[PDB]
Amino acid sequence: SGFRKMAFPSGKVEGCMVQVTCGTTTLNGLWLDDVVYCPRHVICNYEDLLIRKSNHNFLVQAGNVQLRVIGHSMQNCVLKLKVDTANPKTPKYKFVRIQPGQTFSVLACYNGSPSGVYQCAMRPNFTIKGSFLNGSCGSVGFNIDYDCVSFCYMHHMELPTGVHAGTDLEGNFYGPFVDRQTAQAAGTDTTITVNVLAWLYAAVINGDRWFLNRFTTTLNDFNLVAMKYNYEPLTQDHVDILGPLSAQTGIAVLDMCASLKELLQNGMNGRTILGSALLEDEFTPFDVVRQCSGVTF
Amino acid sequence: SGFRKMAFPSGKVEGCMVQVTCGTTTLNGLWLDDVVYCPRHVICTSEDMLNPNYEDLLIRKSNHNFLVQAGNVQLRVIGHSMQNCVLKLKVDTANPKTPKYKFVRIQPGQTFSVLACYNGSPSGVYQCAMRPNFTIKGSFLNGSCGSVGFNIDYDCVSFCYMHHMELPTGVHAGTDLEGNFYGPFVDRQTAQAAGTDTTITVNVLAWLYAAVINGDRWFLNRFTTTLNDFNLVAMKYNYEPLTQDHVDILGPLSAQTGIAVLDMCASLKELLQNGMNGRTILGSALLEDEFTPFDVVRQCSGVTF
Numbered sequence: 091s092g093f094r095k096m097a098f099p100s101g102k103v104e105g106c107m108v109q110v111t112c113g114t115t116t117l118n119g120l121w122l123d124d125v126v127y128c129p130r131h132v133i134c135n136y137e138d139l140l141i142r143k144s145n146h147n148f149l150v151q152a153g154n155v156q157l158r159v160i161g162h163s164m165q166n167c168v169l170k171l172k173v174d175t176a177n178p179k180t181p182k183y184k185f186v187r188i189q190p191g192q193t194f195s196v197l198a199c200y201n202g203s204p205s206g207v208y209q210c211a212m213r214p215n216f217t218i219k220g221s222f223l224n225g226s227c228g229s230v231g232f233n234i235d236y237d238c239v240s241f242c243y244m245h246h247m248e249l250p251t252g253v254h255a256g257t258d259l260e261g262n263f264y265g266p267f268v269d270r271q272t273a274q275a276a277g278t279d280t281t282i283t284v285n286v287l288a289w290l291y292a293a294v295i296n297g298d299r300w301f302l303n304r305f306t307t308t309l310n311d312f313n314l315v316a317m318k319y320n321y322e323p324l325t326q327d328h329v330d331i332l333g334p335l336s337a338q339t340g341i342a343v344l345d346m347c348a349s350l351k352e353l354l355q356n357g358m359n360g361r362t363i364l365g366s367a368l369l370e371d372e373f374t375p376f377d378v379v380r381q382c383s384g385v386t387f
Numbered sequence: 388s389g390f391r392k393m394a395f396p397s398g399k400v401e402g403c404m405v406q407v408t409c410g411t412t413t414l415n416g417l418w419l420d421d422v423v424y425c426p427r428h429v430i431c432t433s434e435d436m437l438n439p440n441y442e443d444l445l446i447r448k449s450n451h452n453f454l455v456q457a458g459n460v461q462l463r464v465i466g467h468s469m470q471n472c473v474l475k476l477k478v479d480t481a482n483p484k485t486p487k488y489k490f491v492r493i494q495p496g497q498t499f500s501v502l503a504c505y506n507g508s509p510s511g512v513y514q515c516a517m518r519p520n521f522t523i524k525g526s527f528l529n530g531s532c533g534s535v536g537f538n539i540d541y542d543c544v545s546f547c548y549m550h551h552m553e554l555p556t557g558v559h560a561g562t563d564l565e566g567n568f569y570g571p572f573v574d575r576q577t578a579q580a581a582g583t584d585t586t587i588t589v590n591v592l593a594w595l596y597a598a599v600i601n602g603d604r605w606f607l608n609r610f611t612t613t614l615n616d617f618n619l620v621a622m623k624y625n626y627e628p629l630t631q632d633h634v635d636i637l638g639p640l641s642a643q644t645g646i647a648v649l650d651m652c653a654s655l656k657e658l659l660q661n662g663m664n665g666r667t668i669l670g671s672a673l674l675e676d677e678f679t680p681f682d683v684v685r686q687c688s689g690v691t692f
């Protein structure tokens with residue numbers, strides 16, 4: 091028993107973290123095979139600035155060893171530094187683009203040195219509520235499936251509200267953001283409804299049933315209520331995805347939606363669910379099934 | 388900016404996780420140098436668990452009865468000894484992935500990262516605290532025994548906890564890496580219960596200082612308090628007594644934010660009386676006690692917003 095915000099073991103990613111310095115800027119890079127991937131703003135019209143640069147301008151440090159840059163190219167907002175040495179610690183990996191509501195682990199780094207690991211979710215407004223300081227740029231987001239690391243996020247910047255913005259490993263930003271100091275703001279955020287429901291199922295599995303009721307709701311009536319509390323619309327796909335948890339607990343998804351409706355209109359009344367006084371939306375249905383089963387990496 | 392519950396990178400610990408099997412029991416072991424450390428209850432049956440005589444069970448064992456697996460490689464056990472509630476299996480290979488390490492015993496209120504494992508395979512990492520009642524509110528299932536708690540300050544791993552059991556309330560009990568339990572617990576399936584738990588006051592105060600550093604001051608008031616009057620109010624909400632040691636420890640955060648410890652204590656007193664009134668502090672509707680003063684100084688900026 092117990093329900094914690096759990097991150098993937100970071101070891102396979104730690105073996106890829108490097109420090110990249112270009113002039114006065116120092117940030118983190120991801121060394122996979124003979125390529126170091128890092129935010130293109132380390133050079134700060136990016137192609138016009140990049141064309142002036144030579145290979146020896148980029149200093150890459152892997153632990154106490156200096157890597158030799160033998161080539162460089164730009165892909166969207168990511169810089170790809172070709173190095174002379176293949177990373178012997180390169181794990182089996184894929185570059186994947188995640189959707190909002192999906193969760194991932196973040197290995198926060200400073201000077202190519204991992205300092206912490208935390209779990210978080212891609213918000214519906216495409217920002218992440220991370221924990222980053224100056225020097226964190228180039229820190230990466232990932233998930234693990236058996237022995238394969240799926241890289242999904244590279245940190246680029248902080249917004250005025252304290253939230254974070256970044257790209258997939260192919261350099262495409264998540265959200266309507268650009269990589270420069272300009273007037274940018276996160277859009278109004280919403281709650282990830284399918285994740286709150288999964289977390290209510292996790293509470294039932296851990297013996298927390300005070301919020302259950304005899305009632306049910308139609309999907310349309312639930313969405314009419316949820317739209318009023320800035321909750322993301324619940325689709326039939328979300329309902330199908332919650333199927334296994336529904337069969338395990340004996341509580342139909344629309345039956346759990348009727349509990350969520352009552353929680354939204356009436357609150358917790360001095361009570362908590364899994365030690366929380368707020369409705370938690372940073373655990374996906376798969377995260378709940380994985381943590382309430384025992385899957386290893 | 389931002390304030391997350393952050394765990395240490397688990398890589399140096401993952402390279403030490405092994406699977407230990409003795410008869411029908413399978414749990415996790417920690418392989419450091421040529422020794423594998425694991426809960427001594429791996430030698431037990433579920434029957435034995437009521438009143439196990441470990442010395443009697445261990446003397447009946449030979450080296451080849453203990454199967455140790457590191458990945459897909461079988462380690463050979465060449466010796467065994469018991470130290471308190473930990474079994475130490477001497478093996479014929481030193482772990483090449485052994486990091487710089489120490490065995491440290493922590494005090495309640497201290498935090499640490501947990502690498503949860505099943506069958507010598509790490510599955511997840513989370514941050515938690517040693518509760519005042521010596522239990523940990525972990526996330527463990529059957530097969531997690533032998534999972535370890537650690538801190539990685541600088542490049543040295545300080546092992547502080549080894550998981551041994553789950554109490555009836557769902558909380559967890561374990562030992563330091565020398566086999567001494569935290570709390571009045573025994574590795575017996577006897578009727579044991581966690582004592583009434585309390586809130587780690589010095590940690591809640593540190594987290595209020597972290598909120599001030601991140602630009603939030605809604606909860607501050609114009610009042611101060613004596614340490615004794617704060618403790619008289621705090622005990623009424625099941626908060627741990629705040630000692631002069633805690634006040635001294637909060638010194639650097641007080642100097643950084645310009646808010647005296649007993650002034651922050653007055654804000655805490657007020658928060659306990661009023662509640663949050665629909666407001667949050669660092670994204671939380673409850674008062675957080677699983678961040679130490681040291682964690683706050685480590686994670687938060689040196690420049691207050």
Ligand SMILES: CNC(=O)CN1C[C@@H](C(=O)Nc2cncc3cc(F)ccc23)c2cc(Cl)ccc2C1=O
Pocket residue numbers: 091428436527528529530531532551552553554559573574575576577
């Ligand atoms: C809740 N456990 C039980 O009813 C059976 N039980 C087995 C074992 C034990 O607690 N293991 C487990 C550890 N952590 C999480 C566990 C989650 C589980 F769902 C099951 C087992 C877990 C044990 C070890 C010792 Cl040293 C003393 C007593 C016991 C004991 O009582």
Ligand SMILES: [Cl-]
Pocket residue numbers: 492493494497
């Ligand atoms: Cl300590």
